[PDB]
Each structure stands twice: as C-alpha cells, then as structure tokens.
Amino acid sequence: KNNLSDYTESEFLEIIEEFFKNKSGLKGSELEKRMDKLVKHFEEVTSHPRKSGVIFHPKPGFETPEGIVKEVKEWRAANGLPGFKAG
Amino acid sequence: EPGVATGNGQPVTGNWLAGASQGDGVPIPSQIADQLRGKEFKSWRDFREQFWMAVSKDPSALENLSPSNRYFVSQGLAPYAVPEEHLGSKEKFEIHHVVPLESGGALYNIDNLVIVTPKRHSEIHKEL
C-alpha cells in the first residue's frame, strides 16, 4: 500500500491489469479519478524515471501487464532498490 | 451547458497525435468529426467522453497508441502523453479551444478544437 515492498508481484500485477481492463466497473468521471489515483500511486511507489510512461508508452515487448511489472522489477533491481514482497 | 457539435475537422491520417506536441496543436481529424458532428451533448464532460470514445473507433489513432492507451480511450478516458511532454502532474492529452468563449469561440465547434500535450499547452500560453 505505502511502499512497493509492501506489494507481492502478483498483488502489484493486479493493479497494473486495471490499466487494460475495467476491473472496478466504474464509468465516466469516477473511473477516470480512480485511474488518476492509480497512475500517481504507480509513479510514487516505483519511483521509475519514466513515471506513467512505463504503462502508457512502454518499450517494445513490455506493453502487457507482465511486461510493465518486469520493467519495474528490473529497473529497481538495477538501482539497488527494494523489490516486491515474497512471493 | 448543453449544445450541438458542428464542424468538418481536417483530413490528415497517420500519427495525428504526434502533432499534439508541436505548433498550436493538432486539429480534430475529419473521421473523428464525422462521429461527433450533428450530435447533442449535455455537458463538456459529456463531449470529452464521447470524443475519446470516437478516437477509440478510429484505426488511424489506435495503431499509434499503446494497448493501455487503447483501453483508456475505449472507456472515454483521455490518453496519456509521453513523459517528455508532461507538465508536473499534468500528463493527459487535452482538448482545447483555439479561441475562448469570450473572444468568442463556440463550445462545441470541432473546427475550434485542437489536441495538445500538457507541455505544449504551457508553451502556447507563453507565446500569447
């Protein structure tokens, strides 16, 4: 919740999948404000330099929820940052 | 304030959303205008939702969007621009009126609408 290390990889993947499907069932402005919250939360806990770019402008091969998670995992490992909860 | 959309837009195809980060924005594609022209909208929020949903039915736009941005526009949500075109916490592509209502542009005039990145929008404002 507060940090990335509070997430297991599966739990974090659950959030990322919401950027591809309507998990919440919300529509219109309410859906947008939820996705707004998820985006800024994503940027906050991952501390990734490309921010939401990881999700909305992914590198080739990393366009899927699995790829997004893997990009986060790889970047944080490369920067000596704590990874996901085990596991 | 409810209204009726008018305008023909402008006929260009390809990565039309690439022009959103340049100049004074990219005008609304004609094939997008076709889906909006002659329709009634209860509010601007209503029009904004319908606009992106129309973008979601356009192959020329879809092909140049990530799978994530494709889902968003399919839900009537504004797509996100590249990080390079962000402005702090402002990240979404934005619909903007070229001339404001008091100068005196029309609210639902498609020919008065352009798409801009948050970064380009600030640069436009500075040039005024």
Residue numbers in the entry:
A (entry chain D): 4 to 90
B (entry chain C): 643 to 770
Please give sentences taken from the publication describing this entry.
Pyocin DNase–Im complexes were crystallised and structures solved to 2.0 Å and 1.8 Å for the pyocin AP41 DNase–ImAP41 and pyocin S2 DNase–ImS2 complexes, respectively. The PyoAP41–ImAP41 complex is stabilised by an orthogonal (T-shaped) π-stacking interaction between ImAP41 Phe59 and PyoAP41 Phe714. The second aromatic residue, His60, forms a hydrogen bond to the backbone carbonyl of Tyr722 making contacts equivalent to those of Im2 Tyr55 in the ColE2–Im2 complex and ImS2 Tyr56 in the PyoS2–ImS2 complex. However, the second water that is coordinated by the Asp side chain in Im2 and ImS2 is absent in the AP41 complex; the absence of the acidic side chain from ImAP41 removes this water-mediated interaction.
Immunity proteins protect the colicin producing, or “colicinogenic”, bacteria by binding and inactivating colicin nucleases with very high affinity (Kd ≈ 10− 14 M) and specificity; the discrimination in binding affinity between cognate and non-cognate nucleases by Im proteins can be up to 10 orders of magnitude. In this work, we have solved the first structures of the DNase domains of pyocins S2 and AP41 in complex with their cognate Im proteins, in addition to the structure of the isolated pyocin AP41 DNase domain.
